[PDB]
Design a binder for this molecule. Sequence first.
Ligand SMILES: CCCCCCCCCCCCCC(=O)OC[C@H](COP(=O)([O-])O)OC(=O)CCCCCCCCCCCCC
Ligand SMILES: Nc1ncnc2c1ncn2[C@@H]1O[C@H](COP(=O)(O)O)[C@@H](O)[C@H]1O
Ligand SMILES: [Mg+2]
Ligand code: NI
Length: 1314
Amino acid sequence: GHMNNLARLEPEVLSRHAISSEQLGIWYIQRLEPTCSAYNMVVAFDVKVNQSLGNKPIEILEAVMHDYPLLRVSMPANDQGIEQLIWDRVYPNIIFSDARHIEASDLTQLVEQDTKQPFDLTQPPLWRIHCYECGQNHYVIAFVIHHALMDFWSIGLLLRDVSKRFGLVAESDAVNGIEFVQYADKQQSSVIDDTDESLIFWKNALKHAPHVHSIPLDYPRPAVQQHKGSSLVFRVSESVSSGLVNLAKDYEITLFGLVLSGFYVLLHKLSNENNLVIATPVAGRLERSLRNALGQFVNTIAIHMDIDADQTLRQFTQQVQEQLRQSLKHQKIAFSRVVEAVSPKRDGSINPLAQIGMFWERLGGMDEFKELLLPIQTPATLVGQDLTLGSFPVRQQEGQLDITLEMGGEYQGELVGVLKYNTDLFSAQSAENMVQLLQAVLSEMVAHPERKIVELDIAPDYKDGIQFEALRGKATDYAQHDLFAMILKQIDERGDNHALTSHTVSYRELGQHIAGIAEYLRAHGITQGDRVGLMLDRTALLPAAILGIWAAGAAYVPLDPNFPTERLQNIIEDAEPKVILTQTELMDGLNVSVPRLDINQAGVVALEQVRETLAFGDIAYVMYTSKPKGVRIGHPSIINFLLSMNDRLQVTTETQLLAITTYAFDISILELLIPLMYGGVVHVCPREVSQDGIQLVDYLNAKSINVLQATPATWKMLLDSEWSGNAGLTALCGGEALDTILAEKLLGKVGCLWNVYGPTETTVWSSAARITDAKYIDLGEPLANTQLYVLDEQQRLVPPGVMGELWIGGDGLAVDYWQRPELTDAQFRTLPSLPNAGRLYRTGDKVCLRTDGRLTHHGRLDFQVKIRGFRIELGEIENVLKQIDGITDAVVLVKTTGDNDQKLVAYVTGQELDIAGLKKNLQIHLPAYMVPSAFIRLDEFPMTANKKLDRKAFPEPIFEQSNDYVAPRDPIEIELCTTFEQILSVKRVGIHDDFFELGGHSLLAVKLVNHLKKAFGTELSVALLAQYSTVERLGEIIRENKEIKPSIVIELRRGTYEQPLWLFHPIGGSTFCYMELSRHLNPNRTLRAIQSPGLIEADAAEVAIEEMATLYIAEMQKMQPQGPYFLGGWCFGGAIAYEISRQLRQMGQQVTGIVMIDTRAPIPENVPEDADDAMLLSWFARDLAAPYGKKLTIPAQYLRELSPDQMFDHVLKEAKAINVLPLDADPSDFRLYFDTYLANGIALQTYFPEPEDFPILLVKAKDEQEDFGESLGWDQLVKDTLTQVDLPGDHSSIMYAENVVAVAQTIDQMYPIP
Ligand SMILES: CCCCCCCCCCCCCC(=O)OC[C@H](COP(=O)([O-])O)OC(=O)CCCCCCCCCCCCC
Ligand SMILES: Nc1ncnc2c1ncn2[C@@H]1O[C@H](COP(=O)(O)O)[C@@H](O)[C@H]1O
Ligand SMILES: [Mg+2]
Ligand code: NI
């Protein structure tokens, strides 16, 4: 053993101190997430020794521990505060392991693993040393200090002092290792009132600062931050580094000033937000008396820049330097204090106020060590007589924020930096991107110093004219091919084989039907260029009609008969068709001034006889979409589309496609034609079957389909039926976003799955993704002769990792919007930015260009996904809901409320649901900012005629503004409430009020938790309180826990006066009736109330009052062993007080007085009427709810009709339904209440004390209708010493807020305290 001669001894505390406010925040984070290593400071060395080193290391270590008290510090959390304890002695935590067998690559990983082991800041030491034997006289030494204990400036002082001790440097400055606790103490004897001019500065600085930054993430953000992260080391070139130095001097700014400005500009371009908040450390060592002190002095300041893209870099950089200069005036105010004052919404998913940092450190005086402290390895050594030090870089302090930029170092003319990134949010490829973008910003800054921020472009020199070569589609001549010729060829070749299946039509028969329809049309006025309305049912004539209309030279305009007549009529108005091809039934359905042809009258004609006359025209169809927008599509688009689709689907003679989509939706083009291009079979699915889950499942298992295309809706319908899947099926899902849940479900049921995307204006689909893993969904890669561009609002190309608007170019563009040329000219453009792109369609889709060539969809621009600044990943919320058992489908929308405020609304459908528990579920899987403010259940989500979700149709939500007040309903909620009220100084806390929203803040939480694990006697944590911030939610957690029984004593108020007032429970056993009283009593008096054991442990309620009283007096005396006692109670509690007084005086104790609030004297006359079990249960139900001002009337006669077990269930169900029992109350819990009621009843019936003269304040409820005498009987027990006051109220309401104030004040006037 390497510590054989150090020896372990028993440490004792020398002195207690405060923690500085600079330590409080880091301490709290460590206590909030115990496995956090993000504040493990590491400095490590390659150490070669000589024989002469000897035992000097232990000798020196022991000397250093003696010299600097700070190293023997612990930070335990105690009563009403966190403490800094200096121990006389600490056993050093030195770990020595054999690494002689470990390759150098692995050794680094190992040291990084080892140093991340988390500290408990309450068990010393808060530092440790890791040694590795690498070879003989060859070691790696890693020193690890928790940042709560000291800062890097301190590390420097130690490094230099300890180096001198080992004889590595000649000189060392004096180090002070005791000043910090003094500094801590003098600090926490000071206020920082909310009037402090610096505190006001930060509130103003940060008031309008966003909740969370809008950089797009790679992953979905965890509900609770786990501080996992990684680091990327990079260097800025000598050219660009020198440039920066000079540019800074060519302005009036710090180098740091410059680079920070660079950083903001980067985040501006990355997130496209103009409000940005970056956090920077400050040394916090202005007082020179501190410049040699070991300690944690570093404060964080949150700089909040407003970016004006119109600013020149020069103007803007200076604007930063200035604000930075102002902010440094107010660095004295701790970040924890700023967070307290600003009071942002607490959210366990992010750091408050700021999630991006920039550290700039150079640290002078460390001249010999400068290269030994870089993030990169250097040949630099320190040679001493006994040993040599060498560079050993290890990744350290990862996970603090979302992103932290760490800079200040320089090496061989190059600025050295470390990009730190949270690995739960960002991929490594994204980090590299960020570094590359950062590099680009600094270059373009020294290049073009006078340029306007907006005109500055970070994005890669896309020399090819494309952002990635993926986003450009394979070049062919598909758009030149003849579609008609292919189908004609198949008609010759395939012969009498099947073609359509509705009454099966052969290819030969199909040719006849095309001829016959085309000829019929020709005969009745139709020519090339005309437009034919097409109003048909899903028969075998449908595809024949399309091809017939085409062969006649005409274009068809879909008029689906299932669409609303006024919708059909609007299209017909706009499209102005020459005729409408329809069937016999439908001829005079529409009231339109447009001729109609019964397609059933078209004959069959031999194709041979009319082939010369058959040609396609230029236009294929006019398809309408969301005034009416008819998109005109030409045949070269369509043939380009179909051929490009065959490339993927590999359509063959044995292909068999179930066509289900309306021909009034362009994607039907694929389903109706592409088998006919290759000899396969189109199955025209009848509308009824496509809209009926089981009926569709049936037609699938039967007719042996191997290709199916549909929108998500149909797939969901299919899965919601008992569909066994089809492992040969090729599936296409398009038209709407494929969420990860459907994807993982589809994948397990289908052979091949395609996500397929495209607007109508670029011909069915433009791109397609072969989906293989649900966690990776995107818009795929382009079809042939198609190009995809992601542009900003300036129609410039975006940098990778940035969101923009998708634009599409290629052979797929529409001809135009039908007779809407202004619109066409606005939507179909060439762009100066893309001069080789040609004509482009502008989708109005929000698409993120990934660091990958991947396009991920984020849905439109007309749809608001912004709230309070930051933006919402609506799909991530939806994904969670769907995973909840019961929920079948969910849609989350952003909606506006009253004063231009936006809130999340979640719509759900499902078999059986409990809206109540939904919010609690989401709370523990999403960030706070992504939790919906409203849950609306629907039977079915509204669809479009296309079978997509019709978001515009979802009902507008109605928000509950304030949270409804609800009084605590059980002993746990009762204590929790009192505890909240007291700590927050809030007069009255409801069980749905949230700790932090009531004014709570992080240091208070620690107090609260400390108060609780005394009051409950178990280990509660600040994480629990963080995640469960309401009495209700927290009550649940505590309650579920079988290892925690409360005390029968509740402190309602700790006052200053010596003497407590003790209150005793009424018949029910609870102390709720005293809560409101306690709020109006003079707060200088301590109040304690006792509840029955019976409410906590089973069969524990006492049944004789005399025994009850003894038990309670013992409980009392543990807190108040002597003095004269002050007792009282409402109702039965008064009688308990009477008997307690009797026993107290038999013990020689004095009783100052008894408060009785409408107590009926314990005399025979006042005993209740005899009740059967039903009546007792009826009474209990009444008395249970009365304290809450609620009337719960359960007639004994109703109860007698039921069996006993049915009775208790009935009362329980009824009590819960008016909210006077917690929602999770088992029958077990209910028997606890009822049994206590029964016990106290029996006690009442057997208690009849002899007369006795105690000083009694009898407060009579002067409005109670039941008669018990002027004195409620007390004149028979107490003659001379009874003071009676009659006050407004009845026996119950006397204790209600309106009436109980006068009760409280009667007491305070009668039993005064200074
Ligand atoms: C957090 C502050 C604490 C300050 C403590 C002062 C430095 C004390 C370093 C103590 C390391 C103890 C390791 C040890 O006892 O092993 C002796 C080892 C040979 O062991 P063995 O194989 O004979 O059993 O032989 C060796 O491995 C010797 C290695 C010596 C390394 C000296 C490092 C000098 C640089 C100081 C930098 C301080 C930075 C904060
Ligand atoms: N696979 C897909 N993923 C996401 N959005 C899609 C997909 N396919 C189509 N869309 C959207 O659906 C729109 C159709 O236009 P509209 O009929 O006006 O809703 C397109 O412009 C796209 O925004
Ligand atoms: Mg569309
Ligand atoms: Ni050892």
